[PDB]
Amino acid sequence: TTEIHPSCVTRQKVIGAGEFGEVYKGMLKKEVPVAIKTLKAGYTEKQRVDFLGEAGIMGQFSHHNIIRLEGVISKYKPMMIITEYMENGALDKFLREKDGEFSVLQLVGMLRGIAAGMKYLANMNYVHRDLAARNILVNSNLVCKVSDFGLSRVLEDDPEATYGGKIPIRWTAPEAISYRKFTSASDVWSFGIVMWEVMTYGERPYWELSNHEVMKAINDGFRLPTPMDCPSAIYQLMMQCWQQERARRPKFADIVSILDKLIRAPDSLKTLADFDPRVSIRLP
Ligand SMILES: Cc1cccc(Cl)c1NC(=O)c1cnc(Nc2cccc(C(=O)N[C@H]3CC[C@H](O)CC3)c2)s1
């Protein structure tokens, strides 16, 4: 891991803030824009291990759809992790603020990028456990990159994860909820939810259903309905990600292949799944 001298880093604007540090937009020494995450003095041994552990994991990866680590400051205080800066922020908020502004082909291209990053992680034997649009970042080329790495810190730090242990119920596969079995196949389930988030421009999965109601619905066989304006092939793929039996789900290699083929023959995306209206408007 590259050790960066603190003189090389200029923090400029807060883009995120927790109890034990903040995330900043800044510049790294022409200077390049970076994101900078800090850990304030007084941190515990566990906080230090978790904090630097995220950088340790990220430093092992080199892929277009995985957030790139620039370096760390560990000799001086506060400690910092420095990464590339993703100008458009988190994917969930991005889509909610840009409702209806993209083509279907653009949305599917986002999903292909996410799937390629996840294929790489799975092949590298890294189980994400918290794949969700809120943990994808977007740059000024519309490239989506997987973020949020670590061991216990990932689910501990995510407010959407509630007390299995602490898990983000609406994104989590049944076996991970029931018996704590997190694998690349549970990440595939989560990817199906991400597909639904993207195609709905950031709708909250299951809407207002409670966590217990979501689990009951899934166990009874119910699944999220098709988004409006959703290609049939895309809805079919997300439904395959949500198979109860883990072994029946596609692997990320299969997902990447299908999405690639759909993008290469974009007319395939013009066939839409039927949308079930929740409102009836009748006029004579
Ligand atoms: C710095 C760093 C350290 C460890 C791991 C990682 Cl992945 C990173 N890098 C980053 O966090 C980021 C890289 N680029 C980023 N761009 C960016 C720009 C603008 C807003 C956000 C962002 O995440 N905003 C959040 C702030 C929290 C609120 O819920 C609203 C949504 C992110 S964050």
Look up tokens 């596609």; give the residue: 250
125-141 in b/e form (b: 16+ CB < 10 A) is ebebbbbbbbbbbbeee
C-alpha pair distances (Å), 29 with each of 34, 36, 140, 170, 257: 10, 13, 21, 41, 39
Question: Is 71 assigned a ligand-binding role in the annotation?
Answer: no
Ligand 1 residue neighbourhood (C-beta within 6 Å)? 15-16, 23, 35-37, 54, 67, 81, 83, 85-86, 89-90, 93, 137, 147
User: How far away, in angstroms, is 275 Cα from ligand 1 center?
Assistant: 34
Strand partners, 32: 28
3-state secondary structure of 35: strand
- Spell out where the chain has E strands: 9-18, 21-28, 32-39, 69-73, 79-84, 136-138, 144-146
Say how many C-beta atoms besides its own lie within 10 A of residue 194's C-beta.
29
Backbone angles phi, psi at 18, to 5 degrees: -120, -170
Angle at 118 between CA 209 and CA 155, to 5 degrees: 50
User: How far away, in angstroms, is 20 Cα from ligand 1 center?
Assistant: 15
Separation of CA 86 from chain center: 14
Which atom of ligand 1 is nearest the CA belonging to 16?
26
For the chain, state the CA radius of gyration: 20
**Residues designated as active site:** 130
Tokens of residue 143, six digits: 């490239």
Residue 4 identity (one-letter amino acid): I
CB 193 within 8 A of CB 132: yes
For atom 11 of ligand 1, the residue with the nearest CA is: 35
CATH of domain 87-284: 1.10.510.10
Structure determined by = X-ray
Could you tell which of 1, 2, 14, 15 is best to mutate to test the pocket of ligand 1, judged by most ligand atoms within 8 Å of the CB?
Answer: 15
Intervals of CATH 3.30.200.20 along the chain: 1-86
DSSP symbol at 32:
E
Question: Is 94 assigned a ligand-binding role in the annotation?
Answer: no
Intervals of CATH 1.10.510.10 along the chain: 87-284
CA distance 274 to 116: 28
For atom 28 of ligand 1, the residue with the nearest CA is: 16
CATH fold group of domain 1-86: Phosphorylase Kinase; domain 1 (3.30.200)
